[PDB]
Design an enzyme around this catalytic site. Structure first.
Site, PDB file in Angstrom:
ATOM      1  N   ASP A  18      -3.825  -0.719   6.100  1.00  0.00           N
ATOM      2  CA  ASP A  18      -4.468  -1.180   4.870  1.00  0.00           C
ATOM      3  C   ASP A  18      -3.824  -2.452   4.315  1.00  0.00           C
ATOM      4  O   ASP A  18      -4.496  -3.289   3.716  1.00  0.00           O
ATOM      5  CB  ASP A  18      -4.467  -0.071   3.813  1.00  0.00           C
ATOM      6  CG  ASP A  18      -5.514   0.987   4.084  1.00  0.00           C
ATOM      7  OD1 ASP A  18      -6.245   0.851   5.084  1.00  0.00           O
ATOM      8  OD2 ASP A  18      -5.606   1.954   3.303  1.00  0.00           O
TER       9      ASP A  18
ATOM     10  N   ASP B 275       0.832  -1.201   0.000  1.00  0.00           N
ATOM     11  CA  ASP B 275       0.000   0.000   0.000  1.00  0.00           C
ATOM     12  C   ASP B 275       0.864   1.247   0.000  1.00  0.00           C
ATOM     13  O   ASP B 275       1.874   1.312   0.693  1.00  0.00           O
ATOM     14  CB  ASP B 275      -0.945   0.047   1.201  1.00  0.00           C
ATOM     15  CG  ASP B 275      -1.731   1.353   1.270  1.00  0.00           C
ATOM     16  OD1 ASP B 275      -2.779   1.447   0.602  1.00  0.00           O
ATOM     17  OD2 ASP B 275      -1.302   2.291   1.983  1.00  0.00           O
TER      18      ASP B 275
ATOM     19  N   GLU C 116       0.533   5.511   0.427  1.00  0.00           N
ATOM     20  CA  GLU C 116      -0.251   6.689   0.744  1.00  0.00           C
ATOM     21  C   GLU C 116       0.442   7.870   0.079  1.00  0.00           C
ATOM     22  O   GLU C 116       1.657   7.851  -0.094  1.00  0.00           O
ATOM     23  CB  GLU C 116      -0.352   6.893   2.256  1.00  0.00           C
ATOM     24  CG  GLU C 116      -1.031   5.728   2.984  1.00  0.00           C
ATOM     25  CD  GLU C 116      -2.439   5.487   2.464  1.00  0.00           C
ATOM     26  OE1 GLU C 116      -2.839   4.315   2.318  1.00  0.00           O
ATOM     27  OE2 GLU C 116      -3.139   6.482   2.181  1.00  0.00           O
ATOM     28  N   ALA C 117      -0.315   8.897  -0.295  1.00  0.00           N
ATOM     29  CA  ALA C 117       0.263   9.983  -1.088  1.00  0.00           C
ATOM     30  C   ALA C 117      -0.354  11.356  -0.802  1.00  0.00           C
ATOM     31  O   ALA C 117      -1.319  11.470  -0.047  1.00  0.00           O
ATOM     32  CB  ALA C 117       0.171   9.653  -2.592  1.00  0.00           C
TER      33      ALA C 117
ATOM     34  N   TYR D 157      -3.531   3.149  -9.255  1.00  0.00           N
ATOM     35  CA  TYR D 157      -2.939   4.129  -8.350  1.00  0.00           C
ATOM     36  C   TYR D 157      -1.542   3.746  -7.880  1.00  0.00           C
ATOM     37  O   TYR D 157      -0.549   4.345  -8.307  1.00  0.00           O
ATOM     38  CB  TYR D 157      -3.847   4.332  -7.134  1.00  0.00           C
ATOM     39  CG  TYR D 157      -3.491   5.519  -6.262  1.00  0.00           C
ATOM     40  CD1 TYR D 157      -3.856   6.804  -6.640  1.00  0.00           C
ATOM     41  CD2 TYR D 157      -2.820   5.353  -5.052  1.00  0.00           C
ATOM     42  CE1 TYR D 157      -3.554   7.890  -5.861  1.00  0.00           C
ATOM     43  CE2 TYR D 157      -2.503   6.450  -4.254  1.00  0.00           C
ATOM     44  CZ  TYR D 157      -2.881   7.719  -4.675  1.00  0.00           C
ATOM     45  OH  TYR D 157      -2.611   8.838  -3.926  1.00  0.00           O
TER      46      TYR D 157
ATOM     47  N   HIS E  59      -6.682   3.949   5.926  1.00  0.00           N
ATOM     48  CA  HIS E  59      -5.980   5.145   5.490  1.00  0.00           C
ATOM     49  C   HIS E  59      -4.512   5.205   5.883  1.00  0.00           C
ATOM     50  O   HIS E  59      -3.808   6.149   5.522  1.00  0.00           O
TER      51      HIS E  59
END
Lengths: 210, 219
Positions: free
Chosen positions: B185, B15, B17-18, B123, B180
């Protein structure tokens, strides 16, 4: 202070094949790096910002019955899962992970002085490359909690003594690191002060065996 | 008829996150990889079934990364990360050292190895490709394969929202924990993939493609 203010605390746990006279080998390693600022009674939650590394490692010798019982790991199963040995590639990984942390950096391990640190020193010493830990500092959290608390000093006993509930982490290197983190967050400011005052160079840790 | 790339020996749940949504040309702020050997998944043991216990043997890497640009308000709220805070905590940028770190981590995993990310095709994978493209190292992910778990679970279930949380709640009848957040995740994804491991592995083997074929999110 002997070595300035520690900017990173790296909570550490190693699991291994047995006790020191057996000349044991590491079977699991967890590092959890926390910035000093992220540290600066309900059980504390880990800080939002952390780096974590947890690895299983195939040893050259078998785990003892007690070691396999306590750690839930065995040489046979580590090999069926294709785990590699403690080797040069592992040192590349550790060096790069350490490089991402602000310095001075201090390892923190429960019973580190008698077990985790000398064993880590021994594993790293057998590699061709210089130790990635030669610029890093370390402290034992047993001594830290003995000072903060002034009784059993086992990890679970401390946790329950402070928080009055049973610890709830897995029986893993990572689980032990998370419990240790919680204990160290009990009085974070006082813990940091003790670490700063007592930190010593990992380069001065004597290898467990040669 | 044979598989395109053999049986995957390692699945690496991933995973990212960005800083924002794809049109904002986002930068990675957090990355988690959880590597599980094929055999550990297969060895995974009603209505609802208990949430599967993660295998004893796993490798995990979780890192926070300072972006070059700010997080959008929504991003900071969803992920709990901000550029400012990552910086006060001394986080380094996405750089060559990080590629070396990722490579060494991947090197410890038996091959063939396949990344698994929820919405990875739209993504996580293109974004990761983009970050890696600006470095001076070769791609650490050469030789590594990838698949999107949305397609996977759609297939498994067909044998409905497909957000990570909706699936988890359907299968286990309770909400995930720590949404999140990159590791949170990943763990949730692992639990979903442990629902029907044999079927999952079969689908993965058949749909795995080289990460090198993933198109960058932006140039």
């Amino acid at each position: 202070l002997p070595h300035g203010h520690m900017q990173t605390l790296i909570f550490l746990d190693l699991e291994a094949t047995g006790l020191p006279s057996s000349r044991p080998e590491v079977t699991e390693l967890c590092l959890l790096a926390v910035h000093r600022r992220a540290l600066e009674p309900p059980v504390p939650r880990p800080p939002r910002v952390v780096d974590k590394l947890s690895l299983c490692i195939a040893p050259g010798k078998a785990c003892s019955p007690g070691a396999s019982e306590i750690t839930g790991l065995s040489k046979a199963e580590l090999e069926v899962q294709g785990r590699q040995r403690f080797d040069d590639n592992l040192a590349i990984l550790l060096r790069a992970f350490l490089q991402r942390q602000p310095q001075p950096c201090c390892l923190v391990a429960h019973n580190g002085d008698r077990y985790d640190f000398p064993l880590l020193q021994t594993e790293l010493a057998r590699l061709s490359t210089p130790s990635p830990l030669d610029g890093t500092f370390c402290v034992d959290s047993i001594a830290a909690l003995k000072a903060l608390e002034q009784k059993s000093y086992s990890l679970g006993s401390i946790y329950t003594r402070l928080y009055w509930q049973a610890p709830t982490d897995s029986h893993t290197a990572e689980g032990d690191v998370l419990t240790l983190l919680s204990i160290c967050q009990w009085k974070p400011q006082a813990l940091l002060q003790w670490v700063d005052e007592h930190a010593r160079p990992f380069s001065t840790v004597k290898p467990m065996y040669g």
